[PDB]
Design a protein around this nucleic acid. Structure first.
Ligand SMILES: [Mg+2]
Ligand SMILES: [Mg+2]
Ligand SMILES: [Mg+2]
Ligand SMILES: [Mg+2]
Ligand SMILES: [Mg+2]
Ligand SMILES: [Mg+2]
Ligand SMILES: [Mg+2]
Ligand SMILES: [Mg+2]
Ligand SMILES: [Mg+2]
Length: 49
RNA sequence: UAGCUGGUUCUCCCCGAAAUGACUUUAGGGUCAGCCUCAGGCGCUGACUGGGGCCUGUAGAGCACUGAUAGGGCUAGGGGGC
């Protein structure tokens, strides 16, 4: 048993998503689409009705 | 600060919307619902269809009600002549 393959347990796969792409998540971000998708939105739990 | 405008970069595979309601100093913004997607459940219930009951007041029609209406009749009221 050596440093080759004590590797992660076929499922802790660290893999964040990247939203600059061209195929995946693209012009807009992961989501987005629109406006008030920018720096924040009021709360939105407790707050904004 | 910017509920505004602009920009957001590799690939292939599956699914795939919405532009509606409610409230909103809300109306090109939002919150919950609606529609999309993923995971774990349940398992013939699903759209569509057959048969069966119930429920309805449109199209049409009708004048019995509410009103409207032309012609005539009979007929109170009025106006005119002896
Ligand atoms: Mg902001
Ligand atoms: Mg498809
Ligand atoms: Mg307006
Ligand atoms: Mg606005
Ligand atoms: Mg059923
Ligand atoms: Mg009649
Ligand atoms: Mg007459
Ligand atoms: Mg007459
Ligand atoms: Mg006279």
């Amino acid at each position: 048993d050596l440093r080759p393959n004590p590797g992660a347990n076929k499922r802790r796969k660290r893999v964040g998503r990247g939203p600059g792409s061209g195929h995946g998540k693209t012009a807009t971000r992961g989501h987005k689409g629109q406006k008030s998708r920018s720096g924040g939105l009021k709360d939105p739990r407790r707050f904004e009705g």
